[PDB]
């Protein structure tokens, strides 16, 4: 089998060039800038995207070295002879895999810990050095009460003038954009329930003026609730070398998810794309990983996940068999993805690659973590993909893309949570596998690993993640005070008050 | 069997009097006061307690009438001949039970809707008419940073003076009680993350000065985290007519749960008792309902709940058989509970009956809802219990109890959530039972009932429940402004600043 896999790779390389030819009928410039240049020139989303690649390179450089030089010779010309499945049942060499599963997990968790601190330092620093933006001082208020004898405008200003008299500026219009004097003031309007009735006078931080999903305002509350039901139904209906054809059809799914999320009741394109990103993560895990591992009907797969006590064995006995599939998958989707982006085949639309690429990076990471333990020969393919991606994307972000919004580093929590999922899924597989390999002690001793990993995640959920949703009082106050001395707020406020005028 | 059940009731009545005799070796006065007198004289917790009884009386007066005059004759001298189990398999009379399950559920949900509105009206009104209390303006800050060259006191005042300069008053002491000028000010300190690091400068509204669990402050953060692990372990270890003996041992469980919760890291006796209340709800559901229904070992019961697709049949086939058990249980625990309280056998300690009685009321409600559908003859026993309870407790709250704290109506969310659980469990049983009774159409059509019930619950979770955790800006501001005209805040503040002095 190894020579067939190498042949497949050669075929895919040949296809790459044939497609470039049909279409027609940089490294130093990408790598030299440092991360501080990325934060100043592109911003936090670009920086997180790059750090996701760095994280993956570190995770898999480690995994590749251990996988290839320590575990691979234990496991060991078919691909299978290099997998854990070639280890004798009951073997004490499985304790090497056991140590590796805790060390690898500890390393991944350590790397996540590091990235959380790194990214937050950059995020707090970004706030302190940046200029004030209209979206930082503006709240979108919705569910404005219908008051006889009064317009929506009158209802909104009376509410905010009465309850936020020290911070209210002005507003524009059953919803309105309300401006505040300070970031802290806006935080209060969005963090503390406003009216007696919590389902009205709803507050959310405003998106950028240029990122407002203006069609949002067309629908009434009932009308948009009806549409979000339709979106969910359509999403589920969507969920429920010829492999190239498969990949080519996957290339149109992101557009589907975006148009689908656009009618779900979001107020911004950032939310629509983030929502589509999440739908793609769900979609890819279901339609690529579980669909190929748990081969069968959609009903069969659903029934598998209704019986938790058997999941470890269903996956431990199903996943290893797909290692050769996934090498092909990664190579095909790898070059399809990278060539598609270089040649701009998608618009031939999101202003950034995040919606479509974060799910590719993360899906590959799922396979990397899962197969480090089970079949290490996948790891060098993933490592090459990530290294090429890193070079290519540093160039594409600097010279090709033109983001129409900034979301701080709000994609980072996706990466964290998805990574914990990848580790936990792998741990579940390992528990099941040590069971199948007749090493029940390891199977039992590995139960605490998912638990500690989840507790680690919870620690991070309480310790780091809240700062990606909002900034704390200490931070916002220090900046509001700095702005009072450093920024010309008397002009900022004149822009702020008309920033959200509907440009029509 | 019916004559044996009547004999058992007669025996229990005889035992009641024998026990009163050994111990020794009002209705108009309880019922005449209205709910406004309860709110003014006893407060919101007493009012909620009474409304829980009113809710149960209305739920079971309805259920008793339908159960006894509509379903009972359909079902129909053993007790079993009056149960749903006596209905022919495949019978169209099961559509009566089917209609009754939706009507009953709609009625219970309607009654919950009503109570949520009623209770909140009383809660908002209570806030507007009451005098300011020290606990409304005080925040307990914990996780105060260790700063070289500075005391904890210095660290706390510098943080609040710098970030809450418009509202800070004073504080007393790795934790401190910090006072604010307004309720809104305190709300900001407790609702918005304070420091950069969310695990430090933690803020929580202070409990009453007389309700502070002072031992809390003895432990360091690590030391109390160690203890809460011990509490969980001890709790689980506790979880894992001779029926009187059983009930008598259950009477010591509340003391165990209270001492157990006292070392878990709570800051007040209100939290300890509420925590114990929750542990008792968990304990009773596990050790009384599931232990008797799912007869077997603890491991067996745990395994039952690891297979969701079979739960409906395991319970549908197990619960109906216990109807005679539960009639005896309700009668025995009913008189044991009421006589124990009248004679003060528990102190021969909580200042109120809430910790111990809310779980009795709610457990009985679980049985009422479950057996309305399956065996209606239980319902009159529950109805008598609730009616006697209502009379007895109105008297005990007015003349016997002396609460050492006020928690608003914070027990109400327990009642809501527990009630939704009771309805959902009953719906699960009904789905399983219509399956067992060969009426698969009803089994299928009942699936939406748990779903709508849960969506109703979610609606209430967003619509009503947040107001039981805190008051909204509109409410707090209207009151802070009223206090500026109506209350002598210049004296309140002098009491506020020393209110939490450790009385030692
Ligand atoms: C059998 C298949 C369908 C299982 C997949 C479901 C679970 C295990 C995975 C798939 C993708 C994941 C999500 C991706 C993005 C986000 C946004 C963040 O703000 C909170 C967590 C959250 C919401 C993740 C939690 C867990 C998740 C929902
Ligand atoms: C077998 C398949 C379906 C995987 C197992 C699913 C369960 C047991 C595990 C795997 C990883 C876990 C998640 C890891 C990260 C986060 C982010 C936070 O915002 C909420 C909790 C949340 C979302 C966890 C919930 C439970 C979780 C989804
Ligand atoms: C098989 C047995 C162990 C099942 C029992 C577990 C579930 C179904 C029940 C038992 C008691 C219930 C709880 C009682 C009190 C409260 C406090 C409130 O602020 C939020 C909900 C919450 C936390 C309830 C949610 C559901 C609950 C946890
Ligand atoms: C068979 C036994 C174990 C019962 C079934 C358990 C599940 C499916 C259901 C029954 C009732 C439900 C609960 C009803 C009320 C609340 C209060 C809110 O604060 C959080 C959600 C929460 C806590 C729900 C979560 C899920 C729930 C616990
Ligand atoms: C198993 C032990 C060996 C471990 C070897 C680890 C090597 C890691 C190399 C990571 C290089 C990442 C460079 C990122 C540069 C950047 O910050 O953009
Ligand atoms: C197990 C065999 C492989 C050994 C490990 C090889 C590590 C290769 C990755 C080095 C970091 C490259 C970072 C990307 C930018 C670049 O190409 O310079
Ligand atoms: C293998 C299961 C456990 C997973 C969790 C491992 C987490 C390890 C990282 C946390 C310790 C970080 C210590 C940093 C100290 C410093 O600041 O120098
Ligand atoms: C028996 C089948 C098991 C699989 C069930 C999968 C359920 C996943 C539901 C989506 C959870 C993520 C919610 C996203 C919230 C958001 O938009 O930020
Ligand atoms: C065997 C199947 C089990 C499936 C378990 C699915 C668990 C879904 C968890 C949803 C998490 C949603 C978190 C949102 C947090 C946020 O709002 O930021
Ligand atoms: C307080 C936080 C607790 C977190 C617990 C997270 C548990 C996630 C599931 C991982 C363990 C699954 C093990 C199944 C073993 C089996 O039953 O065969
Ligand atoms: C039952 C034990 C669960 C432990 C799971 C790991 C949770 C993370 C522990 C903290 C790691 C960071 C240590 C440095 C703390 C500091 O100096 O701030
Ligand atoms: C088969 C899996 C079903 C899902 C149940 C297991 C997941 C339990 C939830 C764990 C995440 C808890 C997130 C809140 C953390 C916190 O307390 O701050
Ligand atoms: C099945 C249809 C018949 C329904 C009959 C319902 C009778 C309900 C009686 C409830 C009385 C509750 C009195 C409570 C007094 C109070 O507010 O304290
Ligand atoms: C199905 C047969 C029973 C018929 C319904 C009987 C209703 C009895 C409850 C009436 C409300 C009593 C309220 C408690 C205070 C009191 O006793 O006056
Ligand atoms: C049987 C499943 C559905 C359960 C949910 C039923 C909820 C019914 C109560 C909501 C409607 C209340 C209308 C009140 C109108 C008014 O204010 O007069
Ligand atoms: C397989 C066994 C199924 C039973 C699992 C029961 C888990 C119940 C855990 C307690 C949930 C309630 C949390 C209370 C939070 C609070 O203190 O307010
Ligand atoms: C078949 C077994 C299923 C068991 C499912 C248990 C679900 C537990 C839900 C816990 C709810 C905790 C809500 C706390 C809300 C709050 O903090 O106020
Ligand atoms: C958006 C909120 C969704 C709420 C969904 C709540 C579902 C709770 C479980 C009740 C239905 C259980 C039916 C099991 C039927 C079976 O599989 O045999
Ligand atoms: C898929 C449909 C789910 C419906 C579940 C019931 C949720 C409650 C609906 C609102 C009931 C109250 C109606 C009165 C509204 C008002 O006038 O304020
Ligand atoms: C076998 C049961 C396992 C538990 C999974 C079913 C319960 C799903 C959670 C439903 C409650 C959601 C509470 C949040 C409501 C909201 O969005 O505001």
Curated annotation (Swiss-Prot), chains A, B:
Protein name, entry field: Hyperosmolality-gated Ca2+ permeable channel 2.3
InterPro entries: Csc1-like, CSC1/OSCA1-like_7TM, CSC1/OSCA1-like_cyt, Csc1/OSCA1-like_N
Compartments it resides in: Membrane
Function, in words: Acts as an osmosensitive calcium-permeable cation channel.
Transmembrane intervals: 3-25, 43-76, 92-113, 242-263, 268-294, 321-343, 354-374, 376-399, 412-436, 440-468
Family, per entry: Belongs to the CSC1 (TC 1.A.17) family.
Highest taxon of the lineage: Eukaryota
Tagged with keyword Acetylation: no
Molecular function GO terms recorded: calcium-activated cation channel activity; mechanosensitive monoatomic ion channel activity
GO cellular component, one term: membrane
Taxonomic path: Eukaryota, Viridiplantae, Streptophyta, Embryophyta, Tracheophyta
């Amino acid at each position: 089998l190894l020579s067939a896999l190498l042949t497949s790779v050669g075929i895919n390389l040949g296809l790459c060039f044939l497609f470039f030819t049909l279409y027609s009928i940089w490294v130093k410039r990408a790598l030299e800038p440092t991360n501080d240049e990325i934060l100043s020139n592109l911003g936090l989303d670009a920086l997180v995207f790059i750090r996701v690649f760095v994280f993956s390179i570190r995770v898999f450089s480690f995994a590749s070295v251990v996988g290839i030089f320590i575990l691979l010779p234990v496991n060991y010309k078919s691909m299978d002879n290099f997998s854990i499945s070639n280890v004798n049942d009951g073997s004490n060499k499985l304790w090497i895999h056991f140590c590796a599963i805790y060390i690898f997990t500890a390393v991944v968790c350590s790397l996540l810990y590091y990235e959380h601190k790194y990214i937050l330092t950059k995020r707090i620093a970004h706030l302190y050095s940046s200029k004030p933006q209209p979206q930082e001082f503006t709240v979108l208020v919705s569910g404005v009460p219908l008051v006889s004898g009064n317009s929506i405008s009158e209802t909104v200003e009376n509410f905010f003038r009465e309850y936020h008299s020290s911070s209210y500026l002005s507003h524009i219009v059953p919803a309105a954009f309300v401006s505040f004097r300070t970031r802290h003031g806006a935080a209060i309007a969005t963090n503390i329930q406003q009216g007696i009735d919590p389902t009205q006078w709803l507050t959310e931080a405003a998106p950028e003026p240029e990122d407002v999903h203006w069609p949002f305002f067309t629908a009434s509350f009932v009308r948009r609730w009806i549409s979000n039901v339709v979106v969910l139904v359509a999403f589920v209906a969507l969920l429920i070398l010829p492999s190239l054809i498969f990949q080519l059809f996957l290339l149109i799914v992101p557009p589907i998810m975006l148009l689908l999320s656009s009618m779900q009741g979001f107020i911004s394109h950032s939310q629509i794309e983030k929502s589509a990103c999440i739908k793609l993560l769900i979609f890819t895990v279901w339609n690529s990983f579980f669909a190929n591992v748990l081969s069968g009907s959609a009903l069969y797969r659903v029934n598998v996940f209704l019986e938790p006590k058997t999941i470890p064995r269903v996956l431990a006995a199903a996943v290893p068999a797909q290692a050769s599939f996934f090498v092909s998958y990664v190579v095909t989707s790898g070059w399809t993805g990278l060539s598609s982006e270089i040649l701009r085949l998608v618009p031939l639309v999101p202003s950034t690659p995040f919606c479509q690429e974060i799910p590719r990076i993360l899906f590959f990471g799922l396979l990397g973590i899962t197969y480090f333990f089970l079949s290490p020969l996948i790891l060098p393919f993933l490592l090459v993909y990530y290294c090429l991606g890193y070079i290519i994307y540093r160039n594409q972000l600097l010279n090709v893309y033109a983001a129409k919004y900034e979301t701080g580093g709000k994609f980072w929590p996706i990466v964290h949570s998805y990574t914990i999922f990848s580790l936990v899924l792998m741990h579940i597989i390992a528990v099941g596998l040590f069971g199948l390999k007749e090493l029940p002690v390891a199977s039992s001793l590995t139960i605490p690993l998912p638990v500690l990993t989840v507790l680690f995640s919870i620690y991070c959920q309480r310790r780091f993640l809240p700062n990606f949703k909002s900034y704390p009082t200490q931070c916002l106050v220090n900046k509001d005070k700095a702005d009072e001395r450093e920024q010309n707020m008397s002009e900022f406020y004149s822009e702020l008050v008309v920033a959200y005028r509907d440009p029509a």
